[PDB]
């Protein structure tokens, strides 16, 4: 069911200039955010600090303080190391986190990309290069290997805080995490690039959560030259999407968009191509072009 | 299993002299430091180095450059002994699998006579 | 500095107990340890403590070490002639070879027979 994500970006652009910036997601809520310019980690939801008390999230915090200063440098130290192997404009990122499974059944993950491209992971009780990353990679590894300091702090945030800490943000966020917002569908069209063809848009937003079934029909048909786009977020925390078929300039009249959501009951959305309330949609939206 | 030396013991400089000092060392040891150890203050870092043709600036580099030739050697330069200068010069040698291993040398004697 | 060693000097009868203090400010605090410097030479290694709270000893010297409180002490049973060099804490804040050493000031032992 859920995945847990914190979410590291750093940036090095010469032996001055550095900055790291970091995002926290549950499932795809946003649940923390911790710019360079802040000393402390923002909550960005409510219940943000799960069922943790204050001191404990402080413990938490304070470790993470001393983690972002002690990277910045560690990863300086290791460029000045690596005199031609790498060198700045540095970018690295971090996926760490949890995806919790029903009975506490949980799987820990930490993984890490140099110059967008993923190269390690924390595995067990140390870091690992994994397959194609690149051969000088290892003795940075080995360097960073001996300090079993890190190790332990890692092992403890992998294998108890995270399952730890989502199992408390899984509670007091249930009712935020299971909210249903339903969506709103709207027709349009275009010209195609083909002569004597036409582009029919149906957008669907202001939909949550993500799964939703978006298709144009001919009555209990199923138009299969239907295209849906790609997931697109609002700024309120819900989805927008669009189905885009291709039809003969004359076919329209008939067609309906279709949209099946769990916000709607047993209520599909059937959109009518020619309908009563896209005319006056449609009238509402005209434009210069 | 070796030992780290710095040549010289003692050094008779003058006003305004450029200063040479080296640091060898056998433990097989990638990274070698430059250390100065002034009365009442403890040590500082100066140059620094993972390995050949590595140098990096210390703490108090200004008026000191450092190079090294190979991994056994890290030579130091006082670019222009001040006019009253004493000073204590101590070099070490680390493991880079290893912080713990540090070894240090017996120090150099610096003494500027007018 | 992030360092603080006390006394600045210290002055034992031959043969009693001597007690050496530090006290630090540096982080993270990964090892704490403890150098021998006899006059006109180097650092000699006398023992590296690790743990949160850490017990080490070496011959006639021994070291605690307090994660919590920030605070090591050296101390030397059986103080002999040979214990007159200068006594140097130092901290590394990292359990890699990326770290830094922090050096203390030293406290000079004075051994009077």
């Known amino acids: 069911n859920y995945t847990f994500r914190c979410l590291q970006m750093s940036s090095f652009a010469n032996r001055s200039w550095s900055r790291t910036d970091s995002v926290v997601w549950l499932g795809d809520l946003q649940t923390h955010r911790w710019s360079n310019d802040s000393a402390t980690i923002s909550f960005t939801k409510p219940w943000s600090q799960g069922k943790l008390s204050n001191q404990q999230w402080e413990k938490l915090q304070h470790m993470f303080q001393v983690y972002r200063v002690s990277f910045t440098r560690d990863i300086q130290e290791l460029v000045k190391m690596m005199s031609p192997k790498e060198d700045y404009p540095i970018e690295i990122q971090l996926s760490a986190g949890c995806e919790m499974y029903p009975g506490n059944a949980s799987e820990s993950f930490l993984h890490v990309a140099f110059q967008g491209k993923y190269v390690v992971r924390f595995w067990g009780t140390s870091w690992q290069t994994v397959p194609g990353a690149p051969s000088w990679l290892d003795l940075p590894i080995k360097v960073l290997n001996a300090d079993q300091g890190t190790s332990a702090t890692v092992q403890m945030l992998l294998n108890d805080t995270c399952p730890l800490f989502v199992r408390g943000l899984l509670e007091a966020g249930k009712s935020d995490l299971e909210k249903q917002e339903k969506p709103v569908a709207w027709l349009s069209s275009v010209p195609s690039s083909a002569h004597g063809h036409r582009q029919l848009v149906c957008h669907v937003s202001g939909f949550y959560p993500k799964p939703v079934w978006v298709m144009w029909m001919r009555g209990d048909q199923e138009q299969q030259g239907t295209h849906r786009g790609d997931f697109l977020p609002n700024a309120d925390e819900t989805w927008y999407l669009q189905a885009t078929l291709d039809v003969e300039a004359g076919e329209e009249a008939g067609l309906a968009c279709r949209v099946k959501h769990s916000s709607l009951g047993g209520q599909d959305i059937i959109l009518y191509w020619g309908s009563l309330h896209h005319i006056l949609d449609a009238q509402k939206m005209v434009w210069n072009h | 299993g070796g030992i780290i030396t710095q040549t010289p013991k003692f050094l008779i400089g003058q006003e305004g002299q450029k200063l040479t000092l080296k640091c060898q060392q056998n433990?097989?040891?990638?990274?070698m430091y430059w250390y100065r150890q002034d009365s009442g203050k403890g040590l500082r870092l100066i140059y620094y180095?993972?390995?050949?043709?590595?140098?990096e600036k210390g703490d108090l580099s200004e008026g000191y450059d450092a190079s090294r030739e190979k991994k056994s050697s890290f030579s130091l330069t006082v670019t222009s002994a001040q006019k009253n200068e004493m000073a204590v010069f101590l070099c070490?040698?680390?493991?880079?699998?290893?912080?713990?291993?540090?070894?240090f040398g017996k120090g150099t004697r610096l003494t500027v006579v007018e | 500095t992030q360092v603080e060693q006390s006394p600045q000097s210290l002055v034992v009868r031959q043969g009693e107990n001597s007690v050496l203090q530090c006290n630090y400010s540096?982080?993270?605090?990964?090892?704490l340890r403890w150098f021998k410097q006899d006059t006109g030479k180097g650092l000699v290694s006398l023992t590296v403590?690790?743990?949160?709270?850490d017990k080490t000893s070496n011959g006639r010297y021994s070291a605690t070490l307090d994660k919590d409180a920030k605070h090591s002490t050296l101390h030397i049973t059986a103080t002999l002639l040979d214990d007159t060099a200068t006594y140097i804490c130092?901290?590394?804040?990292?359990?890699?070879?990326?770290?830094?050493?922090?050096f203390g000031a030293g406290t000079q032992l004075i051994v009077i027979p």
């Open positions: 070490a040698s680390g493991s880079l699998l290893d912080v713990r291993e540090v070894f």
């Open positions: 433990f097989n040891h990638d990274t």
């Open positions: 180095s993972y390995g050949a043709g590595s140098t």
């Open positions: 540096v982080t993270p605090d990964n090892h």
């Open positions: 403590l690790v743990d949160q709270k």
């Open positions: 130092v901290v590394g804040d990292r359990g890699s070879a990326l770290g830094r050493l922090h």
